[PDB]
Structures are given as structure tokens and as C-alpha cells.
Amino acid sequence: SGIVPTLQNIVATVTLGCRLDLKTVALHARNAEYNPKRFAAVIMRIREPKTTALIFASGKMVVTGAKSEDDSKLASRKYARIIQKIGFAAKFTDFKIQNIVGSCDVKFPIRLEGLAFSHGTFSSYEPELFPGLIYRMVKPKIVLLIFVSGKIVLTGAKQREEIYQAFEAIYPVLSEFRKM
DNA sequence: AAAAAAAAAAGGCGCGTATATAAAAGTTTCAATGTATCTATAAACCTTTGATGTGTGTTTGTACAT
Secondary structure, three states: OOOOOOOEEEEEEEHHHOOHHHHHHHHOOOOOEOOOOOOEEEEEEEEEEEEEEEEOOOOOEEEEOOOOOOHHHHHHHHHHHHHHHHHOOOOOOEEEEEEEEEEEEOOOOOOOOHHHHHOOOOOOOOOHHHHHHHHOOOOOOEEEEEEOOEEEEEEOOOOOOHHHHHHHHHHHHHOOOOOO
């Protein structure tokens, strides 16, 4: 392989443990996008770490755009601190990353036609809307989006580690299906 | 001939085309349930019309003044 699956989004859940006044949360924040007509969750974008989070009336926050487990975790801790400054005793309790989506590259042109045709059972293709293949692995259970540019979009894991394992499993397939 | 307002016109903002990831909230759609509202329909009445025993009626025989 020799290629790290480069994460582009990490979505995580944080139980602040309080019924947050989403109106006051929006009011006391600096740049927060909350109005009920789209969702029941204040969405805040913090530039450091730059993450976008929706926090619900349950006080549960789901965070996206992180580049690491620690980007999301530190961002969520900052989010809880911001909520506490707002006035609600937010606390980092029973945190869990619900999604780790990444894009990386293997850089060798691929016979995507070969894979999809011979892995019709596993991968399906209708190249007249979107030129990417969809592949599944159960161990680890990662779904992977493949495009001729070599871009690999690995999704379906709470951790980047399942991303890494399925990438170490799928890059050999890619090189096998490398078009030249 | 000169001043002012709208259109002619394009390129790009920015997310629909996929697009899967997952939690978080909510909607709408589907089907069983409930109900007043059609209807026929045969079972209620009212009137009709053909068949009907018989009250009244033609012969028999009568006490009864005449």
C-alpha cells in the first residue's frame, strides 16, 4: 500500500448532559447558525479545530469535517466549554465518533470496468450519472467509493483504523485492477 | 441632441445529478376503524277487483174474519 487513507470528515457524538437552550446557545455564540426551520440543532463552525457541529435539544452534538479523532475530540471539548460559557454545564461524557470518512489516492489508473463487471455481485455501475464504483468489505466493514482519478473515498467506520485496514486490503485489489 | 433605466448577456455560486457514513428530528403515507349517507327491498297500508253466501224474494199452503 504505502498510502495512508487521508480522512476528510469525522462525525462524532458528544453527550453534554444538559437540555441546552438552543436559542440561548445561538444567542451567546460568536458565529453559530441555528434556526428551527432546518433542524433542532445549533450548528457551530469553530475554525480551531475547524469543525461543523449540530447540537440538539437532547444536548447531543454530532461533529463533522474533523481531520482526526483528536480534531473532533478537542473541537467537542471546546464546544462544551463554549456551551458552559453560554451557561449550560456541558460535559464530555460517553463521546463516540459515529463516522470517519476519508479521501486518499493510489494514483495508478484503474480498470474500474474490470472490477465492476467481474464484481457486479459486489459492485454496481451505471456510468451515466456518476463515474464511481461502490465496494463493500465486512472485515473491516468499510464501503469504498472508487474513481478513475485514483481517489479512494473510504467510509463506514467509527475509527480511521478500520479505514486503514480495509485500505490495506483494497489497495492490492486496486493495483491488481490498475489500468495502464 | 442629451439624460436615465432595464435588458442583453456570462460566468460563476452553489448545491440537484450520484454518493454512503452515521447518529440526531419529523412527515407523510397507508391501512384498520368508525360513521352518516346513498340505495334497494321486501315488508308495512290502502285501494282495487274477481269470486261469494246469502237477505230478500216467487210458489205453496195457511186460520180467518170476511
